[model samples]
Target chain A: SLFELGKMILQETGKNPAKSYGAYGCNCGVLGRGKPKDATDRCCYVHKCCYKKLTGCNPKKDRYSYSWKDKTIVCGENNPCLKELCECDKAVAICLRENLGTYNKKYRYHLKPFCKKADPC
Target chain B: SLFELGKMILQETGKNPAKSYGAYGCNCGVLGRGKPKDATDRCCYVHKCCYKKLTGCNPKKDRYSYSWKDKTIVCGENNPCLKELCECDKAVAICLRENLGTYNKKYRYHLKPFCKKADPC
Candidate 1:
């Protein structure tokens, strides 16, 4: 009656999947590759969706000037993240993470000097 | 009791998974990230495995010489394939497919001059 139960059985069979699972499986009911011909035909379906949480965001491209250093924002009325987090909002951040895995470590530390040492989107 | 049903529902919920579904959802029973821990902690488990059917195989590391051009072998006694197929038994084919998707067209055609126009393993 649920997808979690079904997935457990397959992983036990050593079924070499082609991708990684996520917090939740990309259900084949709606957001998946295609809709079932008529239902009850769940045969070949995989969960290949984007992990949006690991990435960051940007807002300096428009209102604020491009400032990575000597400039920071918090959860304030003037661009604040409530904490000392600058939330990497750069569109380019996601592009970099597409291949290099996560936007943290060397990639984020070096390229994303804006949110230099903070959690991202 | 099933993975398909779960994936279907999640996809409908727009879970935004980090991987793709396969012919069958990789069950999270015994081949997942880790053990259940106590038996009722099924949370944050994703399916991350390899797809074997899409890739080909090899068999010329020994016994026979490396032959991909001029010489051909089928699924038979003389490396014959009963028909006119050569079942690309070269390890390189799989390596190529790993990056360029399939070993067909320019990659498989130009590189695999031997099984140039046949279905591989």
Candidate 2:
């Protein structure tokens, strides 16, 4: 199962199980519809599906809150799902850095839409 | 007058006060003539004139020694001319950052030219 594989990755790397997974396209989850605004947004689109297919996970807080500058984030010791999600988010940031010249110049300052908060398990 | 203004900038901002100086073009110093290969090269062309016209200064070593990640370099506390040159080099880096989406993707890895070393004054 994908979740089993995702969990295996989490246990081994203690990070996102994979850099990318699933089909690459711009039509992501609920809000990630229509053509991607730019290359950076395209990375987000891929990451959204990576989360859905790999972990069947949901973040405790908004994913947008995770900054690219931070090396990693702590959700809790045992919440494997959120940990996978954190790694997935960081992978998107690494993608943006690699694709730096392709994204919008102001993408760094614009916050993605999301506002929920999740407590530690 | 230009060096005087350049010195003033070094004293006040402790940096390359003017982000840009001189006419914008790709024909730089001895090796910089001809069309710029990419946006990052264009920034380098502009910085060359900034060094030539403003300070009439030569670096002790190569300009490529400066890395964009460092906030500043230790050319010397009192070598005001080299201090201005250092700031000028940093300004080009700052330009590259501001125009991140415009430069060649591989520009970060390229080593710029120059091959002399000067002892600290």
Candidate 3:
């Protein structure tokens, strides 16, 4: 069932099917251009598990380091690099934060389930 | 002279050597304990002159995907953790492969003068 759901998402988005939808491991989220070995799209299971165990599942605020000027230097509006890079970084950050849940709670639950199950509970 | 040779290599590499022993751009290297916006050690100088204008400095054969029982589950041997996360991902991949020194004769030469005349060239 999880695989089927994952397949559907990949098919719809033309992304990697093996990728987890929610914050399961470090590699979950939007697929990058490169392979997992490149650490481009590969998720960090350890980070995810640690976060989930520490927090729970909470919405997070995102931030970026590179400026708009930086993006303009790399790509034009047709393919803005800054926006893309920022988006990727933000996605990773949010995924980690959400999956980690709330640090105040002290993780209580395991994050591995988020990677394995469909709900990412 | 290069910030007093980077303060004499941070007073003889007691560390913090103002970074940049070689390599240009990005946050140099070895000063990692949070800082520089918290990107670990914060170095990317545009992936070191785009891999030194696409491959110049050479001498790179580093690779690691995290193993060894996953660093004994985190910090042991006084302070292990998979040999310190594969030596911080191979020192940011050999400082972006030796400051992108050999991509061709095309990078021509301009890694910001090895970040302002300290020999990143």
Candidate 4:
């Protein structure tokens, strides 16, 4: 269902729908090595690859930006491409989560920040 | 369902469970200001805060690491804290995604990176 979901979403709206989920490992993001550094990185890889499959979605151009106004516009209009992008991201996030047992202990420690007195837990 | 899911996950395994989803906006991660720079940044905020609520979990120390060995240990050991962290990240990633319709048009263009002739789509 997940495979077809993106395809279905892209089919009706954008031109030239995506064919496959791109290459293996984390190839998403403008700045990063191709292979995944960790399991979490793999999650990102799936996310970006999912984006690639979309008819009009492009991860680099569709990547995160640095302004509230910019974000506001993306989530504001009922744009199909944006909707698909979010779904792709969410699906991978879910996929990574559901499969955490596959790689948790070895890489779990890395997600945390150093505790500080000033910070709120 | 989403709110309770994290609470439920943390309640069973960790000690001193998280009370709330932390403060408003993105308060996760070691670097970056307290406020969110964009909607996508808000996604990270929720992710970090989710980590904060888990017992024995700290976003700073638990943050992403560069080495595969570190990640391998985390996902391999079946550690509860690590599992929760991945779930938290996934949940927020889902949350941000589900809510993308809240902001997609004006901000959609930013997610894509600049196209290069050498780069694969």
State how far residue A96 of model 4 sits from its true place (Å).
Answer: 1.1
lDDT of 3 by residue, A16-112 (tens): 4332333222233211111222132233332233334432222122222332243222212223433443333334444333443222221111122
Ten-residue segment with the worst summed lDDT in candidate 1 chain B?
B107-116
Tens-digit lDDT track of model 1 for B89-108: 22212222232322122211
- List, residue by residue over B13-72, the lDDT tens digit for candidate 2: 344422222112232111122245466556556666567654544542223222322444
Model 1 bad stretches (over 4 Å) = A1-46, A50-121, B1-91, B94-121
The residue-by-residue lDDT of candidate 2 on A25-108, one tens digit each, is 332122343355566556656666566654554442222223222444333334566556666655654554555466443332
Q: What DockQ was computed for model 2?
A: 0.01
Angstrom error of the Cα, residue A65, model 2: value is 61
How accurate locally is residue A2 in candidate 4, as Cα lDDT from 0 to 100? 25
Better of 3 and 4 by lDDT: 4
TM for chain B in all models? 0.16, 0.44, 0.22, 0.38
Shift in Å, residue B23, candidate 2: 21
The lDDT, on a scale of 0 to 1, for candidate 2 is 0.40
lDDT of 2 at B53: 55
- Fnat values, one per model, are 0.00, 0.00, 0.00, 0.03
What is the TM-score (0 to 1) of candidate 3?
0.23
lDDT of each: 0.21, 0.40, 0.29, 0.37
For this target, which candidate reaches the highest lDDT against the unseen true structure? 2
